[PDB]
Ligand binder design. Structure first.
Ligand SMILES: O=C(O)CCC(=O)C(=O)O
Ligand SMILES: [Fe+2]
Length: 199
């Protein structure tokens, strides 16, 4: 249960293969990299971005940049497959006007994890975030408006799309260590795309 959240399991099943081809295309321009947090610690999840803006870590904290700090070049353009799926999911969830200008791409290797955090780097917290999972299943955990609220667990599997809007948009959340396994399309990892209106 998550007020404001719209869970569309297997919604992206049909576009999965194409999405994976485009993730590889994006990674060819802006390679996956394990960003270092302001405290000086390497994240276990590997990331990259496509679209006008990209989420990244900085010395002063977190922020969106139109330039890839590693390549010093713009992030790859938002592929059509990405925009089309996000549009259908957003509209289906009730957000037909949602127009993302950034897509953070996370890659989870076996054991990779993402500790509890809030996504508050966006200008308007009223705009939802569309999440698309691919490959191996992962346990998504979330709490409440506070970092010490009751944590709930939700398994996200290949093709699962969740539109995080309303109150859920501000919930603390994370991903538990990815259990080892095999998937025909991603082999041994999980991918997650999150579309955001960062501009
Ligand atoms: O991988 C996930 O399902 C969570 C992605 C996320 O919330 C983020 O990276 O900010
Ligand atoms: Fe997040």
């Amino acid at each position: 249960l998550a007020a404001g959240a719209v869970i569309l399991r297997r919604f992206a099943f049909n576009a999965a293969e194409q999405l994976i081809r485009d993730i590889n295309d994006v990674a060819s321009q802006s390679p996956f990299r394990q960003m270092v947090t302001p405290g000086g610690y390497t994240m276990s999840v590997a990331m990259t971005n496509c679209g006008h803006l990209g989420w990244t870590t900085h010395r002063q904290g977190y922020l969106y940049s139109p330039i890839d700090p590693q390549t010093n070049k713009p992030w790859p353009a938002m592929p059509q497959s990405f925009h089309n799926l996000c549009q259908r999911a957003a509209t289906a969830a009730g957000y037909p006007d949602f127009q993302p200008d950034a897509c953070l791409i996370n890659r989870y290797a076996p054991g990779a994890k993402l500790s509890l955090h809030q996504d508050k780097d966006e200008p308007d917290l009223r705009a939802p975030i569309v999440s698309v999972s691919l490959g191996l299943p992962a346990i998504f955990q979330f709490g409440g408006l506070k970092r010490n609220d009751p944590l709930k667990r939700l398994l996200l599997e290949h093709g699962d799309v969740v539109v995080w809007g309303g109150e859920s948009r501000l919930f603390y959340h994370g991903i538990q260590p990815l259990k080892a396994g095999f998937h025909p399309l991603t082999i041994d990892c999980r991918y997650n795309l999150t579309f955001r209106q960062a501009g």
